[PDB]
């Protein structure tokens, strides 16, 4: 059960510098070398970096050999990568990436594999500013009420960057759930709806809740969504 | 760096139907080992890419017996035998034999389905969001197939343009069903002046249009 989580993904001004981390859990971290990979449309997959499991070497993508750091603290059991003088086209999401087969423990047989992978992280590159969003209630009512099913939701707007993430009731409800893709509005921020379906009946007996998180303005929303009478 | 092309990049299947996706390399992917690192991966959105295929033909653990790969040199194929509806996302071949690893392009399965005719839902502005100056109207078409749909607004009968955005669901890993969500954006001052705010809905699965429709201040 080996598992990744990545963190730091930020807007970051063109020129700048952001550091990412990557917390691995359950294997030996100081047993695997470790690697960035990003996706893009502009770049698609793209690797980027290992360091080997004794922390002594590192490999470089061209694209950011010299603007790029990767490190590990096995003691915090975190891989870094440090992004310097960033540019547009570095906008992507981060993932760290390791391999459950460590039998040949140099170059270049930890590139074979390539097999266990971490949720990611957003970096967006822009001469922008970081805004959170506003969390309103799409109240259902009987004009979100369709036969044996009624929807209701919560309305994301004005946000950047990418991206928000939504709950429901802490994750005790996941049957239904559309969480749309963002669409960038002519104010140059991002909206989005998340929905769900629940039985039309259920109406006025239940509580719903959207736990809303913006992670780049370290936003956080718990918004009751509540009937309307019509 | 080695080039990986895959073909096609958009494969349409109908559900229980066979898939085959082509890898081709810009050179041998045979290593000095006499190996070959080629790999498939599958990712759905939102989600990390997951391994499928390692050196050509070998299945990860716990991977579906549908999933195969063949292929020699500089040409690779990926086949499922009969598409389920979990197989819908992206898919990846990826080469480790000459550093640095190398991806495809990513190939995309979309599943055919039967119609299905979106269920139609109305959301009127918030109380909170008139108070900040401006009311978001939502209309959502749920669950349907194919993509193609008609969305539009009317506001006391007045057909509405360029004041309104849409957003897809990618197609759904249980159902292989789509989902639309259509926002109209007013002014508090140009909500307040109108009464009847209408989402209409053409789709192959209706009989005819769907109008989901509210008044101003019923709700």
């Known amino acids: 059960q080996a598992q990744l989580v990545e963190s730091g993904g930020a807007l970051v001004q063109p020129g700048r510098s952001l550091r990412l981390s990557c917390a691995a859990s359950?294997?030996?971290?100081?047993?695997?070398?470790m690697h960035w990979v990003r996706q893009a449309p502009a770049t698609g997959l793209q690797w980027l970096a290992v360091?080997?499991?004794?922390?002594?070497?590192?490999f470089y993508a061209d694209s950011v050999k010299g603007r790029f750091t990767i490190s590990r603290e096995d003691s915090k059991n975190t891989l870094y990568l440090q992004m310097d003088s960033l540019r547009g086209e570095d906008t992507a999401v981060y993932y760290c990436?390791?391999?459950?087969?460590?039998?040949?423990?140099?170059?270049?047989?930890?590139?074979?594999?390539?097999?266990?992978w971490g949720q990611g992280t957003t970096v967006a590159v822009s001469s922008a500013s970081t805004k959170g969003p506003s969390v309103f209630p799409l109240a259902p009512s009987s004009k979100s009420t369709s036969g044996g099913t009624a929807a209701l939701g919560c309305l994301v707007k004005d946000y950047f960057p990418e991206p928000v993430t939504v709950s429901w009731n802490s994750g005790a409800l996941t049957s239904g759930v559309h969480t749309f893709p963002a669409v960038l509005q002519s104010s140059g921020l991002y909206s989005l709806s998340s929905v769900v379906t629940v039985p039309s009946s259920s109406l006025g007996t239940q509580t719903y809740i959207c736990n809303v998180n913006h992670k780049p303005s370290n936003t956080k929303v718990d918004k009751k969504v509540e009937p309307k009478s019509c | 760096d080695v080039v990986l092309t895959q073909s096609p990049l958009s494969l349409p299947v109908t559900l229980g139907q066979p898939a085959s996706i082509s890898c081709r390399s810009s050179?041998?992917?045979?290593?000095?080992?006499?190996?070959?690192?080629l790999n498939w991966f599958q990712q759905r959105p939102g989600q990390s890419p997951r391994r499928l295929i390692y050196?050509?033909?070998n299945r990860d653990s716990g991977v579906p017996d549908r999933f195969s790969g063949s292929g020699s040199g500089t040409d690779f194929t990926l086949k499922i035998s009969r598409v389920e509806a979990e197989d819908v996302g992206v898919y990846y071949c990826?080469?480790?034999?000459?550093?640095?690893?190398?991806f495809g392009q990513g190939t995309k399965v979309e599943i055919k389905r039967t119609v299905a005719a979106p269920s139609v839902f109305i959301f009127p502005p918030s109380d909170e969001q008139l108070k900040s100056g401006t009311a978001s109207v939502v209309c959502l078409l749920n669950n349907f197939y194919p993509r193609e749909a008609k969305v539009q607004w009317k506001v006391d009968n007045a057909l509405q343009s360029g004041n309104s955005q849409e957003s897809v669901t990618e197609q759904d890993s249980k159902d292989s069903t789509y989902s639309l969500s259509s926002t109209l954006t007013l002014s508090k001052a140009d909500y307040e002046k109108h009464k009847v705010y209408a989402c209409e809905v053409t789709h192959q699965g209706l009989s005819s249009p769907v109008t989901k429709s509210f008044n101003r201040g019923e709700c």
């Open positions: 990826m080469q480790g034999s000459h550093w640095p690893p190398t």
């Open positions: 050196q050509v033909s």
């Open positions: 050179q041998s992917l045979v290593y000095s080992d006499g190996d070959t690192y």
């Open positions: 360091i080997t499991s004794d922390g002594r070497n590192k």
């Open positions: 990436v390791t391999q459950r087969d460590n039998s040949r423990d140099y170059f270049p047989h930890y590139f074979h594999d390539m097999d266990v």
């Open positions: 359950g294997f030996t971290f100081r047993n695997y070398a």
